[PDB]
């Protein structure tokens, strides 16, 4: 979030931070440099002298501390600060200082891509396995269902084949080979499954779509 200068917590000096980071980012990274640069960067700003933060110099948190202290700030970087909303002091003191920040690319506006379509960012196998775990089958249905028309076929109740000749007006259903007229079902499947099955039949392969779970077993 960006606060305006009003709300920021301010220092006695009327200085206020351009940037508030969180202390919980600190112990677990072991990112002490950030602190010592910050300590230094402060002295530096105060003193005009460019702050040598080179590795393997004889420079020291203790030395940089002494210099800041000479500049009339508390030497460990902290600064009493006043909550901007109320003006009241902050009960705790806030490690305050310049620190070189880089602004990195790949900015928000470049990654807001919101491809909602009526007529990362995916739903891959892993998110599928997630929705399964959830129990959420109809969501899984809605989300994986292709735009492919829910085309309606008819089937024989013996050989789950799509060999049912349907005179729908006349209410007449004949499955040749099986001698079926009464034991016949109608099921909706994506037309691209209908096709795939016919393509499968075309290649001498019976994909039998049944309607009961347990077999003749």
């Amino acid at each position: 979030i960006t606060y305006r200068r009003e709300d920021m917590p301010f220092t006695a000096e009327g200085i206020v931070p351009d940037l508030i980071i969180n202390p919980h980012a600190i112990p677990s990274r072991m990112t002490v440099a950030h602190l010592i640069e910050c300590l230094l960067s402060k002295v530096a700003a105060l003193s005009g002298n460019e702050g040598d933060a080179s590795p393997f110099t004889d420079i020291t948190v203790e030395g940089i501390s002494k210099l800041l202290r000479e500049h009339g700030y508390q030497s460990r970087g902290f600064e009493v600060m006043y909550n901007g909303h109320t003006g009241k002091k902050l009960m705790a003191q806030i490690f305050f200082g310049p620190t070189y920040y880089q602004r990195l690319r790949h900015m928000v506006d470049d990654k807001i891509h919101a491809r909602a379509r009526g007529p990362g960012l995916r739903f891959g196998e892993m998110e599928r396995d997630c929705m399964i775990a959830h129990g959420a089958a109809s969501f899984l249905k809605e989300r994986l269902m292709e735009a492919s028309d829910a085309f309606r076929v008819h089937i024989c109740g013996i050989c789950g084949l799509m060999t049912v000749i349907a005179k729908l007006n006349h209410n007449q259903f004949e499955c040749k080979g099986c001698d079926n007229k009464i034991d016949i079902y109608q099921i909706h499947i994506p037309y691209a499954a209908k096709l795939l099955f016919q393509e499968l039949m075309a290649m001498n392969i019976t994909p039998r779509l049944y309607t009961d779970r347990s077999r003749d077993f």
């Binding site: 200068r5 351009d18 202390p23 919980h24 310049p98 880089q102 990195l104």
Partner: protein, 117 residues
């Protein structure tokens, strides 16, 4: 870098590569696919010595933020930051961004030209 956890140096070494600075001074004169130029590139208040030979104080990539390590409104948790909006207004971290696009005319087509019109 000798005060950092070892891997943290590695990470930085990467992100520095995605810092916005002033890649070249002649940038206004190059047409390069992406360009990110910082309004107010400042030298780091904390320079390195090796920094000299790197021309960093010359073409710096970043600015000196007045940074507070604070739990503030609660809005800077888990690696967010509360940025000072006013600072932003006065120019802090603004950047030019030059996307330059390129397009040509026809390959071999027997009077199958492409016309910029």
């Amino acid at each position: 870098p000798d005060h950092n956890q070892s891997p943290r140096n590695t990470y930085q070494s990467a992100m520095g590569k995605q810092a916005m600075g002033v890649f070249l001074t002649n940038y206004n004169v190059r047409m390069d696919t992406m360009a990110n130029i910082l309004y107010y590139p400042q030298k780091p208040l904390g320079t390195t010595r090796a920094m000299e030979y790197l021309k960093f104080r010359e073409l710096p990539a970043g600015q000196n933020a007045i940074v507070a390590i604070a739990c503030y409104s609660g809005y800077n948790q888990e690696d967010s930051m509360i940025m000072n909006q006013s600072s932003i207004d006065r120019g802090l971290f603004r950047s030019l961004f030059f996307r330059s696009y390129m397009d040509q005319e026809k390959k071999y087509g027997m009077s199958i030209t492409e016309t910029f019109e």
